[PDB]
């Protein structure tokens, strides 16, 4: 396996004090439990129950995430990432961190954002709406990459949209990591439909560009109205359905370039496939969302070679966003 480096923000953490990325030695400063009053449940998560609440101290609208017991190392990482990124554009802000003195169980308190069900939301988005919100997610990603942090779970579930106020937040940093040039990460880190080829072929020296693939998947679902775009049945099958769109030739070039040991179990399932034109996924029900610049932007995000992909700031430059600059 040939080593790899991020083309941007390569050395952010290299020139940052230990205290910035050494989340393990980070000490949490707790708030008061009794400062918060629960109002409504917002639904079950896999690792937390989420409640609508109010800070009775200053009457601020809050959301509290009551955590299920999980390894504390993981939550310390999330907290330190949240703290390092606070104030950033379209980054959810951690307001406070509290603990229940009777049950010991911790809970994270975030700013309230009024979220619309994304399933019904993408169904009504205008051409401008896709560009605008895409430009907003980009803001959060460039910011967080510039702070030496990969999100690693970019997907519609983790994007809070308040449509009436056209306000967007990137949430759920529980999988996020600090980028260190040369470091090998574990690849079991995204949601299936949003995993980058680098994860699926078990290439460990990845970077911020992973998020840009995921953001690519989101764009493909929005402009084509096919959510999710790559609907694989498992990790192996996920690559196959990517290969069915991007082609097997560029996939094999990708492994060769990085001297990747492709899992022997891929031998009978990949086959041969050609690069499809993006205009093939265009029909009369989604046509109004698709423009030449949209298809160019997408093609420059969905590529096997993670180094080839547009960086977040390079993506903000694209023709596709020329109207959303006002």
Swiss-Prot record:
List where in the cell it is found.
Nucleus
Entry GO terms, CC:
cytosol; nucleoplasm; nucleus; plasma membrane; PML body; protein kinase CK2 complex; Sin3-type complex
Q: Does the keyword Transcription regulation apply?
A: yes
Region feature Interaction with beta subunit, mapped onto this chain: 33-38
Looking at its record, which EC class is this enzyme?
transferase
Q: List the catalytic activities from the record.
A: L-seryl-[protein] + ATP = O-phospho-L-seryl-[protein] + ADP + H(+); L-threonyl-[protein] + ATP = O-phospho-L-threonyl-[protein] + ADP + H(+)
Q: Which GO terms describe its molecular function?
A: ATP binding; Hsp90 protein binding; identical protein binding; kinase activity; protein serine kinase activity; protein serine/threonine kinase activity
Single GO BP term: Wnt signaling pathway
Q: Does the keyword Kinase apply?
A: yes
- Give the residues annotated as active site: 153
The family line of this record is:
Belongs to the protein kinase superfamily. Ser/Thr protein kinase family. CK2 subfamily.
Q: What is this protein's record name?
A: Casein kinase II subunit alpha
Which organism does this sequence originate in? Homo sapiens
